[PDB]
Design a binder for this molecule. Sequence first.
Ligand SMILES: [Cl-]
Ligand code: NA
Ligand code: NA
Lengths: 66, 67
Amino acid sequence: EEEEKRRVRRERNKLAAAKCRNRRRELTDRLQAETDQLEEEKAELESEIAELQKEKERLEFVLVAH
Amino acid sequence: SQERIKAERKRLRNRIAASKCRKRKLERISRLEEKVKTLKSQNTELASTASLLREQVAQLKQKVLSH
DNA sequence: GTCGGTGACTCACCGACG
DNA sequence: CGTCGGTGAGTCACCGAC
Ligand SMILES: [Cl-]
Ligand code: NA
Ligand code: NA
């Protein structure tokens, strides 16, 4: 019965291992969702920039004509 | 015995597969952490370019409208 | 000095496939 | 068919933190 501290240790470490694996799955899912969102925000910014640069040059050529 | 050699070879094969499996998990995380850091940096730069262009556009609409 | 976190070995399980 | 590899989970050995 002295070796019963050994049994509680196995049970505690089992839960610790499950927690470690669950945190790694959660981190992977968090980072993937974060990447997806950041990729979307990058595309929108690149789109807004492209439209703004077009409008900038349009106005520049209107002004040069007057 | 052949039973022992076979059981040991299976453990070797599985130890190889486990190390490869674990490595791919950590490499996916490492790859994703880098991409997140890069995208945050790039989007900050893009946001500042957009902000400037918006002001430049605003002023040009004023120069045009003043005619 | 005990505890939890984690890398690594191992077994169970399942689908892949020659 | 029978064996393999990929993966989840239990275990051990080890370490750092409080
Ligand atoms: Cl070994
Ligand atoms: Na958890
Ligand atoms: Na290894």
